[PDB]
Design a binder for this molecule. Structure first.
Ligand SMILES: CCCCCCCCCCCCCCCCCC(=O)O
Ligand SMILES: CCCCCCCCCCCCCCCCCC(=O)O
Ligand SMILES: N[C@@H](CCC(=O)N[C@@H](CS)C(=O)NCC(=O)O)C(=O)O
Ligand SMILES: N[C@@H](CCC(=O)N[C@@H](CS)C(=O)NCC(=O)O)C(=O)O
Ligand SMILES: [K+]
Ligand SMILES: [K+]
Ligand SMILES: [K+]
Ligand SMILES: [K+]
Ligand SMILES: [K+]
Ligand SMILES: [K+]
Ligand SMILES: [K+]
Ligand SMILES: [K+]
Lengths: 48, 244, 271, 243, 194, 244, 271, 48
């Protein structure tokens, strides 16, 4: 996978010149998968 | 909260192995004689070989062929372990071993509508003998996965009163109230283990005591389905496969 | 007013061993799609699971990993030694469909230019020639000929290279007047006009044009040019429903109606 | 830009070069390394494993029979049983062994060699044989007396079915070429010598027993063995595209 | 979650293709539907969110969430069994064979939906997203099948619709990932666009 | 004492489950790649379902039909797990699950007399392909419990040298020395688990390299018997039974 | 359950001086190959030895040193300006035989591409032309022509270079869905099929194809291409018996039976 | 032989881009040469 050690020096003035970002993580998808006001726990019934 | 208010929630989920059963109209859950299935204690055991404990391969829910609640329906019954003797790895372990021990989780299903009425007694009877005939037929003592139809419900096929079968672990499927019954059964016998091909420890009966009726024109075809899961099983005396 | 948090993760979720469950309390399997929420039933609640320390990463699906590579956006041949290309990514469908997966996005871009000489019969030639690619922002005068004064390019940025050199390449920043590019716009290009041709296009997405020429006249041959674009440092918002019909126009998302997406099978009961 | 001056070699493609280069999938994350038995880190681990020598490479021997050294009840004394050049990389009985294959993937070798032999006659069949290693200088020994002047082991058939003759590394130089090709390179210079086997006493059997028996021959590199300069194995070739 | 174009048959056009037909039975243990669970192959899954992105990659891994919502009347009841059959053979031929695999028994009621998790059960950590066989022999990767059967029956009051629909949703679980980006085969062009 | 004097005792006892194997003429015991069978680690696993671990019901010795060491005998081979795919509960667990993982304990038997001579190579080869034919026959790639006769021993049925098969875990049954070979094999594959009906991880071969000969008049009928025990097994992906 | 240790060494073993031995106790020379173990008789025990501080290294036989160099894996000429090469290493025998020395192996690879123009009579031309090598993973659409839309390559990785530039070169990671590549597979490609053509091939070893084209049409000439592969960061398991018969097919290890490997000599007693 | 001093900086993101490994040692071959349960010392007889 990705190297734990590698050179990352910027040679140019503008950030647009920089190489690709190297984060690549993901975030909890709840804003898309469960955009609801009331919490509906996995162990309970959804509606009552 | 069911616990705080002191009542039983009508919804339930039963998960064993790779199987999950749900119902939204249950009537609590019965645990036979208040005892959950347990392993054989070293102080009760007699067979000296290390037992086989198959785990999830056999301790899961097996659904049997459905039965129709016909107009002349007298009831239906299944012997255990007979009914599952040829199903999945539970059946294989039962066949390949001389000795077997285990409990059960039974889920009987029958839904209709708020326009139907009818009541089924769902009872698990220990050592239930089908002795209405001078010489009982093997087809009726061991009906297999298809189970067998009742011929003498009032006398419970054994010369006792149907109304007193309530002394055994049971529930009722009263259509206006629930559409399923769930029973957890511990192993019961006068021995630590026994042969799964010569002795049926329990018999599950589903008997109509209040006939199925409904508003004119409603669906008339109402099935009854039985789903059973072996639980906490162990086997001894391994050899080639042998069926009754 | 953000009530839903978004913690970051660098690996997918582990699996923890689970056991049987026989109760009236917990019912993970029961759901209700009407709420608009995706099921929250977990693997461990539906079956008995084992422990799985899952070290599978999530890097290749990040916006940077998905968009961070070059794709064709322009392809043409000079005529009279010149060609005017209006900067837009609707001509070639592959990159177009990718961008439309997001409603809004900010990103820098790396443009790579591959050019070679071809004759009248479109046969490639081994001929090294100097070419000029000039970026003409809206409002600036566009050259009419291969030798017009605008090629002096004292203010307009230009890149001069040769078909005998490696492909030319330059980075561009996030240039929109908006705070993000829009790949879906339910509005019109101007006030006082509601004609269909002015609908669904956000003018701020158009930053100008690239005019190309050979520095001197080719004799009977033409310059073939391919322009590739690679998004960089991508930030995106509001995922969209993917294109599910063929594209038909460069500037609009017009499509041909259809009664099915996937092909039919004999019956729903046979996989 | 930083002033630079490019040098000879620029643009060349040396197959053994070792530079860093852009990855086609810069963010790719491979499957995890799982526990698999038998990891090998160096092929010296393989050549140290004994494999059968195709010793009886004669016209009358086909297939499996080529691994068997013929032994038989003698009616004369001090007779010869077999002979072989010890060089692991030359054409012959050694070329199809594990040791031989890898040696043939290299130009030079060094190290002692393990030649082990297993007797396969009946439990009642006895015998004593002498196996000798003759360092280079002349031709293979002509008789047992000459052979026994070199490095050797006297083997007695019994419960322990096998014997090992170590052909110790005895060479002028630290390494030897793996081929003895002479016409062009004059590599006969490197010949490592010979291994010969003779009856020390005789193969003896009870009444009506098989009067012939077999010995299987194994060979492997010792712990002081190494190889240098990789080269294409001459045994692997093709005359056209494969079906 | 997004809708699976599950009823992809000649008689179903447009919106109707999202509906799994259910009807009052006059026989027991009958089948309702079947589908290969592979998210990247041509079929009902190809037009889903999960399918589109899976088709932008060469390999996948992870459990899948298949959720179903019953849409009959409040008075319409029923119990159905949904099973996942890990690979090795063909799709199960009857309910008895199907129930031997991973499954959930669904009871129609107030909570309109049920989830059947198709857990990641694979020899390798990843599977190819296509099962193309002629060239690559990728049928090697088939993930199995999902089938649905009547557990009891769909039951209704007098004069009620004797047919109803189930909508089918699918999504990746939290242990799902994709590798090796590739061009989506559904996006193409034969010439310059107007 | 074998340990004190630094030698290997010629007697051995192998006990697994309800089975015990003994020999009085062994030649030590080989443990493939120096590794005993081990369970799948949580960090190597990928299938998320709780596995079935049958224990003694499947981890025991199964004896296959014997093979005769005929005058024209070229050798015989058995694929694993193919050879035991229809034997006992090991076979059943293999059939009912998509995934299987396990090691082995192999005991090859062949006794004659101190008046006989002959030598068999007993080798366990990982991923051994029977590829001497343009289109290999299923009958030869998966011969089942009966195993299959060698047709091309010199080329090891795969285009390599028979003499180099020693790079794989092996022993020899040299009649003057021993009458049995014993090999313990760990699970080997490029995956954590795999299908027991589509892939054979190991192939056991018994090949005569020194022909069977004997004093005139001695018993001529000399069988070769293979007894194999699965060890440290686990299965995932339960469903109905499926064979190749 | 590993009972046998594997200590590492950077040099071969030294020789220690030894003296004579006349005893009934120690018998290093007596062995028993039946056990499956290779002899453990040491040099010092078989003859009287001297001290030798042996500094000979072991580097050139390491997996990295043995495999770490480029070898030809593909060679072809375009037809109609295009060529589709299914990625597999069975076409050219040298690298193939090397890989088959291991049962399982993980490694990254460095691919180097050497291309030049040739005419109809296969005579090389001094002609610089741009070419494109696109990696098409299984499931992605393969272009039918030199100018098909797939060449836009918005997602598929592509490398565009010129016959006038140095050979193209890119590294690829360990891409198998498995935890190691397999160079020997005793199984079938799918369930429900036992045809011989589906035996001995592990599908996960096939990662797709490389499609090559010249960016523009050559006039009467073709593009000749050679692809080399160099394994890197090699990890290997389970050494195998080396190939000892000629290869005959690209996808199978089928061979012609033989009664001998080495050539015959007059007699076993004459070296 | 190999230099005791040389530059080893990675310029790329993915480890696949790195130059060849520079270990090259060998390990005791016993797992292949002597994969047996009972130790058979060099000075003793193999079987008894
Ligand atoms: C002189 C160097 C030439 C290089 C090219 C410079 C191009 C500058 C324009 C950059 C704008 C790119 C973003 C456009 C995105 C919107 C596309 C669309 O909606 O169609
Ligand atoms: C755009 C750059 C092109 C470079 C080529 C990329 C190739 C990607 C495929 C890498 C897979 C290599 C491993 C194959 C090993 C198995 C071979 C075999 O068994 O025949
Ligand atoms: N003569 C034909 C065939 C040559 C060929 O395919 N040669 C094979 C061996 S039979 C090879 O490996 N060539 C190596 C190379 O040319 O690099 C041609 O040049 O097109
Ligand atoms: N054959 C014409 C048209 C080719 C063309 O426009 N092809 C489109 C798809 S229809 C494309 O995307 N080509 C990619 C490329 O050539 O790089 C030409 O070469 O001028
Ligand atoms: K268990
Ligand atoms: K994790
Ligand atoms: K829930
Ligand atoms: K979910
Ligand atoms: K157990
Ligand atoms: K040393
Ligand atoms: K010894
Ligand atoms: K040795």
């Amino acid at each position: 996978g990705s190297n734990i050690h590698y050179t990352n020096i910027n040679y140019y003035e503008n950030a647009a010149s920089n190489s690709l970002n190297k984060q690549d993580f993901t975030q909890d998808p709840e804003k898309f998968t469960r955009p609801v006001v009331d919490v509906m726990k996995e162990a309970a019934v959804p509606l009552k | 909260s069911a616990e705080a208010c002191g009542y039983s929630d009508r919804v339930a989920q039963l998960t064993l192995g790779n199987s999950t059963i749900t119902t939204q109209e249950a009537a609590n859950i019965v645990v036979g004689y208040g005892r959950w299935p347990t392993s054989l204690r070293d102080t009760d055991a007699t067979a000296v070989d290390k037992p086989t404990q198959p785990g999830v391969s056999a301790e899961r829910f097996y659904t049997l062929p459905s039965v129709q609640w016909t107009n002349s329906f007298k009831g239906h019954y299944w012997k255990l372990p007979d009914a599952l003797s040829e199903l999945g790895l539970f059946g294989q372990n039962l066949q390949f071993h001389y000795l077997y021990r285990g409990g059960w989780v039974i889920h009987v299903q029958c839904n209709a509508t708020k326009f139907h009425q009818g009541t089924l007694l769902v009872v698990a009877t220990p050592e239930h003998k089908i002795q209405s005939a001078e010489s009982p037929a093997f087809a009726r003592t061991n009906p297999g996965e298809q189970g067998a139809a009742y011929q003498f419900p009032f006398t419970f096929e054994d010369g006792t009163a149907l109304g007193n079968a309530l002394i055994y672990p049971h529930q009722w499927v009263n259509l206006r109230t629930n559409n399923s019954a769930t029973l957890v059964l511990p192993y019961v016998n006068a021995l630590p283990m026994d042969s799964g091909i010569r002795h049926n420890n329990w018999t599950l009966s589903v008997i109509p005591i209040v006939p199925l009726e409904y508003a004119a024109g409603a669906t008339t075809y109402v099935p009854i389905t039985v789903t059973i899961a072996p639980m906490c099983t162990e086997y001894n005396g391994l050899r080639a496969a042998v069926t009754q | 007013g953000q009530v839903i948090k978004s913690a970051v993760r660098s690996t997918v979720e582990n699996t923890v061993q689970s056991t049987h469950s026989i109760t009236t309390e917990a019912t993970p399997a029961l759901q209700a799609a009407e709420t608009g929420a995706t099921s929250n039933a977990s693997d461990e609640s539906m079956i008995e699971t084992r422990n799985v320390v899952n070290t599978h990463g999530v890097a290749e699906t990040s916006l940077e990993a998905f968009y961070g590579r070059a794709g064709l956006v322009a392809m043409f041949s000079t005529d009279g030694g010149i060609y005017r290309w209006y900067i837009n990514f609707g001509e070639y469908v592959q990159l177009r469909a990718k961008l439309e997966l997001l409603t809004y996005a900010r990103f820098d871009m790396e443009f790579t230019i591959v050019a070679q000489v071809v004759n009248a019969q479109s046969k490639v030639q081994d001929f090294n020639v100097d070419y000029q690619v000039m970026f003409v922002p809206p409002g600036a005068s566009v050259p009419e000929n291969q030798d017009s004064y605008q090629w002096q390019s004292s203010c307009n940025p230009s890149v001069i290279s040769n078909t005998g050199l490696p492909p030319a390449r330059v980075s561009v920043p996030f240039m929109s007047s908006a705070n993000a590019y829009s790949f879906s716009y339910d509005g019109y290009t101007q006030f006082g006009d509601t004609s269909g041709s002015s609908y669904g296009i956000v003018p701020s997405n158009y930053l100008g044009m690239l005019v190309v020429r050979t520095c001197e006249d080719l004799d009977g041959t033409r310059l073939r040019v391919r322009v590739y674009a690679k998004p960089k440092h991508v930030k995106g918002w509001i995922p969209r429903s993917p294109r599910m019909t063929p594209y038909k126009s460069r500037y609009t998302g017009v499509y041909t109606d259809t009664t099915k997406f996937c092909a039919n099978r004999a019956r729903i009961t046979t996989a | 830009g930083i002033p630079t001056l490019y040098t000879p070699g620029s643009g060349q493609f040396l197959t053994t070069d070792d530079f860093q280069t852009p990855c086609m999938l810069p963010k790719f994350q491979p499957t995890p390394v799982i526990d698999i038995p038998g990891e090998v880190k160096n092929f010296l681990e393989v050549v140290q494993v004994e494999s059968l020598v195709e010793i009886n490479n004669v016209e009358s021997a086909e297939g499996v029979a080529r691994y068997r050294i013929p032994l038989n009840v003698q009616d004369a004394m001090d007779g010869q049983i077999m002979a072989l050049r010890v060089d692991p990389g030359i054409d012959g009985p050694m070329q199809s062994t594990l040791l031989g294959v890898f040696t043939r993937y290299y130009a030079q070798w060094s190290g002692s060699l393990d030649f082990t032999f297993m007797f396969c006659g009946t439990f009642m069949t006895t015998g004593k044989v002498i196996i000798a290693y003759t360092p280079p200088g002349g031709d293979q020994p002509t008789n047992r007396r000459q052979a026994m002047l070199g490095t050797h082991v006297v083997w007695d058939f019994g419960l322990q079915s096998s014997i090992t003759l170590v052909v110790p590394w005895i060479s002028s130089g630290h390494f030897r070429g793996t081929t003895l090709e002479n016409t062009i390179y004059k590599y006969r210079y490197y010949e490592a010598g010979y291994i010969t086997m003779w009856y020390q006493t005789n193969m003896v059997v009870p009444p009506n027993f098989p009067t012939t028996a077999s010995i299987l021959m194994f060979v492997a590199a010792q712990p002081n063995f190494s190889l240098r300069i990789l080269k294409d194995r001459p045994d692997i070739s093709q005359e056209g595209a494969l079906q």
